[PDB]
Amino acid sequence: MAFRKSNVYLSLVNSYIIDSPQPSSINYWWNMGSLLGLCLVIQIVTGIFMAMHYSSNIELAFSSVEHIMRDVHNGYILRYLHANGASFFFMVMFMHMAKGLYYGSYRSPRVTLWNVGVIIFILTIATAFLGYCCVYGQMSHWGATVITNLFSAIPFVGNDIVSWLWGGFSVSNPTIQRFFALHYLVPFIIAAMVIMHLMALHIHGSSNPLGITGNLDRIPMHSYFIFKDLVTVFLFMLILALFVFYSPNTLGHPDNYIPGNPLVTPASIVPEWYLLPFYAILRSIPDKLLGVITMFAAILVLLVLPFTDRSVVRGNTFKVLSKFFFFIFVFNFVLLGQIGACHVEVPYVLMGQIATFIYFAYFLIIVPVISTIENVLFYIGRVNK
């Protein structure tokens, strides 16, 4: 047999990216995964090269990033790529998750693939949080304070956990140094989870836009999808370059260009854009503990989808009501993000609470009710007696 098949190492490359049988009809939404792999590579490489010039000590952190921006040759490119890359990582991940939602990718036999994906989502959010803390600007200090404090809600031992995470009385030197060490580590854990994600994907292959079997007409990954993925790789790079070179701080917060100050929380404080919808969900609950619980539940609720989707067919392509409500969910998520960027004022509080209810209702009420109605509609719309 060919060397690419007989060799112990190349056989893996061949099974995953050369001879892998792909459904002939997968569309451009199936290109987001390769984009996520690219993002992870971009982040790890730019991150390692910046780490060579970074100092984690709380008194040196902010200045070391400025040193990267000013003194390191092409340092500003590394930093803007890493910072804008993180935003892009989340935008593509949101699209990857949305595609899965729309096409019923979370359904059996891909429940394991979906669950590993949820874990990766959590690790990625955590990694981005740790990195943001490393800049040690005003948003870094306060984001570090608030997020670590989320654990103080744990009854009985909460305050002890927070003091442990801090390594002191408050977010200080011990905190930033451990956050950087951890920021370096998690991306490697994510890489290992991505391998687990790919292993789960490989045993069943990808789904397709029709939601039916792809076993009757497959085409090899090599050439077809290798070159189709290249199209989006260049589009992604083009757009990222536009931000990196022409509008590098648009996706960020000006307050992070101000060194962290333990005595002053700026009135203009706002979380990173990709965290806004979750921030809005937390803010919607006028209780400390329930707010924290509800926010984490917003992520964990993704795990109930294989069970609440009662439909007999996979995906939304041929479902009128499901398609409509999917877009209701999408814009509701964007609204949640917009509410998060607003002050806690009338009528934003009520809007946020309603949008929060809608977010959860989608998974727990809308999907099961609508999918059941649609099963019956498909039945009585043709059968007769």
Binding site: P109, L216, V334, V346, Y348
Partner: protein, 93 residues
């Protein structure tokens, strides 16, 4: 190698689909086709035709949300203006 669990997808030669018979496919080499000039007129009419079938599924939900947002935003702007101070005191507490 050890025995592994069966799935719903195999590999070339045993993909796991039903036996096929009676279907005949035909194809022509990319090298023998017109240098991708059949784009416009053959894809410009189809484009937007596909989105004409889908736009309402996207646009209506978008419209509902954009108007809900604008309404709340305008109400907020009023509540914090001099003219809205009366109502602000009422709805705030």
């Amino acid at each position: 190698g050890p025995p592994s669990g069966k799935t719903y997808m195999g590999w070339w030669g045993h993909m796991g689909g039903p036996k096929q018979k009676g279907i005949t496919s035909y194809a022509v080499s990319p090298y023998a086709q017109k240098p991708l000039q059949g784009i416009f007129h053959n894809a410009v009419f189809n484009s937007f035709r596909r989105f004409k079938s889908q736009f309402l599924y996207v646009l209506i939900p978008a419209g509902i949300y954009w108007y809900w947002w604008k309404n709340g935003n305008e109400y907020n702007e009023f509540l914090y203006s001099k003219a809205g101070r009366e109502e602000l005191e009422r709805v705030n507490v």
